[PDB]
Symmetry: none
Subunit: 154 residues, 3 copies
Amino acid sequence: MVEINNQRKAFLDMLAWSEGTDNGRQKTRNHGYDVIVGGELFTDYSDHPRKLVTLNPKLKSTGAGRYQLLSRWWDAYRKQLGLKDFSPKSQDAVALQQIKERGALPMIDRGDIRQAIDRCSNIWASLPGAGYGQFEHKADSLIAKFKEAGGTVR
Amino acid sequence: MVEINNQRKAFLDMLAWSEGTDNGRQKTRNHGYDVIVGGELFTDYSDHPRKLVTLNPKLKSTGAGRYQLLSRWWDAYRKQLGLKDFSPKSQDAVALQQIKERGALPMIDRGDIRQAIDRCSNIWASLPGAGYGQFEHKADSLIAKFKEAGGTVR
Amino acid sequence: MVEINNQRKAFLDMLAWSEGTDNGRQKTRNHGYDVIVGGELFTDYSDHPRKLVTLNPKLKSTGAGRYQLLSRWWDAYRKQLGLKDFSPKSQDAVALQQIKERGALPMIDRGDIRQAIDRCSNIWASLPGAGYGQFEHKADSLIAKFKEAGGTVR
């Protein structure tokens, strides 16, 4: 399993905030860990809710959990990591594993958050990529949230 | 909010032992309720001491009290539960609230401690499977401690 | 300057189409190489036009050229690659350099376009990231364009 440390935890909190699952606005009984794309909540943590939500006549998504994990990616990782449920710890595990695969861990650990965000933009829709126009602006908000979660930026 | 019963009290004692705040070795004048991460003690219970013992980004911690509650979580819960101080009763309240949120209360009440421990590993670093670089007690030692605190296991 | 080959050329054409600079509808006198974000054209190729265009209150951008390169990245790469102008050749050079830095060149050369697109999504806003809700469908329309530009997919 990818180890959790203060920098990584702060990154996961920034991410939960960015994705809108744990931002003090969206309703939740457990820090966004029970949020289904669209805003509904689930209570059974034995598996991904797998509820297909139509966000509009031309947009569907199965994102669920604190990091809005798609069901197809959940299946891949649950098998790969040997996870027995979709509990908060399992959700953190998958997110960290995806961050690991993108080579972002060293960046997070050392405080190069702007780079970590860019590297992870291909996984999470709320994160901007560096070539996009609004990056500098969005990264400031993200960096601020990262800092208040206790992370240290370089 | 969350009322205390024998099973829950036994869980909190097991937790204090696990976290190293109340284990008969760590110094304390009040059963671990005055312990700051690192081992120093505080005497003013009107608020979380809000101290760290390292500036190392990965290792940084503000844990304080019997259950080593981080200051950022303290602020969230203080507001949410309407707590006026960081007294032992307030500390117990926050811990029980976090346990309630991870869906572990029914598990504790019925004696399914191994499951409750797993669900709570996402909150406390000493609980087996937590995934930090810290020492994690074996489930067996935890269950033994839970039983000597008067809890009944199924 | 990174070398151009048929696979790479086809990727740059797919990209110009995806970004809307060279798609048969947007006006241009030079295959999108003269397009400023928003749709205006420039004629002086000695430097990036450097116009900050407001697309809406929340979205501003300085993208210009066939691949909609932001001015700040233009300055970085101009210096790094020793470019003396913002001519079509220079624009291609920077795009290829960015693709090289994302490790997508081998993917493009071998025909693994879906992977290359995902790796490059952090640079270009029109490209989809793999964790995105509709990756497979958007990738399909891009692959079609890549193939008609003469590229071979695996």
